[PDB]
Amino acid sequence: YIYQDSISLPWKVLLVMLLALITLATTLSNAFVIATVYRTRKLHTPANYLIASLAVTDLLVSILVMPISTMYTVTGRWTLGQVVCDFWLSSDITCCTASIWHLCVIALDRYWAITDAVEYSAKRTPKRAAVMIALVWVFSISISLPPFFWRQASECVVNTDHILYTVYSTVGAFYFPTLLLIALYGRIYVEARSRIADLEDNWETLNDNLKVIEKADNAAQVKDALTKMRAAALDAQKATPPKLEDKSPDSPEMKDFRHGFDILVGQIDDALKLANEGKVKEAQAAAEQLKTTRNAYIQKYLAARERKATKTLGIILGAFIVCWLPFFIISLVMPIWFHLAIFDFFTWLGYLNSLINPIIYTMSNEDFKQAFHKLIRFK
Numbered sequence: 001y002i003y004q005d006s007i008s009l010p011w012k013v014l015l016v017m018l019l020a021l022i023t024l025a026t027t028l029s030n031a032f033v034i035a036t037v038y039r040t041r042k043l044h045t046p047a048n049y050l051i052a053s054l055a056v057t058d059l060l061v062s063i064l065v066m067p068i069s070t071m072y073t074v075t076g077r078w079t080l081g082q083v084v085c086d087f088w089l090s091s092d093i094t095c096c097t098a099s100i101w102h103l104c105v106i107a108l109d110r111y112w113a114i115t116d117a118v119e120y121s122a123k124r125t126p127k128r129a130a131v132m133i134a135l136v137w138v139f140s141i142s143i144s145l146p147p148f149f150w151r152q153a154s155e156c157v158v159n160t161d162h163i164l165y166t167v168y169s170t171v172g173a174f175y176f177p178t179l180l181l182i183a184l185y186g187r188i189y190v191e192a193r194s195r196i197a198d199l200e201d202n203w204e205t206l207n208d209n210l211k212v213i214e215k216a217d218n219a220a221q222v223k224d225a226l227t228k229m230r231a232a233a234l235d236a237q238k239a240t241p242p243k244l245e246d247k248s249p250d251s252p253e254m255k256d257f258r259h260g261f262d263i264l265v266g267q268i269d270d271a272l273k274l275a276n277e278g279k280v281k282e283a284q285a286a287a288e289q290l291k292t293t294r295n296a297y298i299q300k301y302l303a304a305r306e307r308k309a310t311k312t313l314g315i316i317l318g319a320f321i322v323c324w325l326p327f328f329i330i331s332l333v334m335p336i337w338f339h340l341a342i343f344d345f346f347t348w349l350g351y352l353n354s355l356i357n358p359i360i361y362t363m364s365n366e367d368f369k370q371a372f373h374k375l376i377r378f379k
């Protein structure tokens with residue numbers, strides 16, 4: 001029985017048009033993300049390479065799996081033969097597993113960057129990124145390779161004979177990566193929370209000590225509030241969590257919040273020199289410059305407190321669960337309920353995640369956002 005045989009001609013052609021536009025929108029949205037990393041020299045960093053390889057996996061899903069699926073989902077019958085069926089099922093398992101595992105490799109990279117910044121800076125290289133990507137693909141192909149027990153060769157479905165592999169495939173491909181992502185997001189969320197809580201205190205110490213220099217009575221009072229201000233600025237500079245946007249070291253970092261403390265420290269040192277010279281009135285007058293420099297970084301400070309990197313990783317985590325949790329839940333309860341339409345809906349729900357992810361990055365990451373605005377000639 002095929003439930004699709006009951007669907008009318010107008011609803012069938014509309015369903016083909018909806019599915020074909022999702023497939024096309026996934027291909028172009030991921031093609032944009034790949035080209036943007038490739039074309040922009042500023043984006044040639046291991047972190048953006050992981051975005052670019054996630055976009056490559058999602059592009060293969062849109063070329064090897066989704067077009068050839070639209071017809072099978074709407075008609076409900078396989079007409080391409082056994083050989084094409086073998087490659088289609090395996091490219092569905094391999095690319096979707098690669099898609100899921102790219103997400104935790106991006107999270108692993110963000111976790112190490114926010115949790116172990118000094119030790120990781122030396123290890124975060126494009127060679128490291130390649131080795132991790134190869135491992136993801138080798139693990140992806142290894143998941144789809146065992147159901148080749150088809151010693152027998154209208155219907156095209158993956159081998160459901162061995163319950164032990166069926167659950168290993170579901171765990172290795174989904175349940176293990178989600179538990180890793182929850183743990184990874186948890187540590188990242190808590191890291192950023194304490195990093196902005198420290199940034200808030202160092203910012204307040206900077207503001208209050210800046211008030212003291214103005215209302216100072218002694219030279220020793222001026223000199224002390226300056227060294228305290230000096231220490232808080234460099235502490236605020238380390239407290240500020242990493243941005244969502246990743247740029248290569250060889251790129252001008254103007255109006256950057258972390259740079260504001262560098263020029264500010266330079267000014268605090270210039271003022272302490274006059275204080276050590278004996279020109280305290282001049283050292284006090286240097287606070288008028290410090291006041292304006294601080295005033296120019298308030299907007300960049302208030303921006304840091306919003307933790308865009310963890311916020312957007314939360315939206316990706318959220319988008320990943322809401323897209324794949326129904327599929328892998330039904331995938332486990334199916335051997336042990338409603339019709340085959342809910343399986344077709346939940347497969348496409350997982351497919352949709354290949355489109356949601358590149359639109360989340362290009363709306364959130366300002367490098368990808370400005371690249372898009374350039375593409376459609378919008379200012």
Ligand SMILES: CN1C[C@H](C(=O)N[C@]2(C)O[C@@]3(O)[C@@H]4CCCN4C(=O)[C@H](Cc4ccccc4)N3C2=O)C=C2c3cccc4[nH]cc(c34)C[C@H]21
Pocket residue numbers: 092093094096097156157158159160169170173327331334340341343344347348350351
């Ligand atoms: C989205 N993609 C879809 C794809 C799939 O369901 N393909 C078929 C061809 O479509 C069905 O859903 C259809 C729809 C209506 C009736 N159907 C079935 O009765 C069986 C159910 C089934 C699900 C899982 C395992 C065995 C059988 N279907 C199929 O075999 C397998 C996936 C998968 C399975 C196992 C590990 C995995 N890692 C990544 C993935 C993946 C990607 C992931």
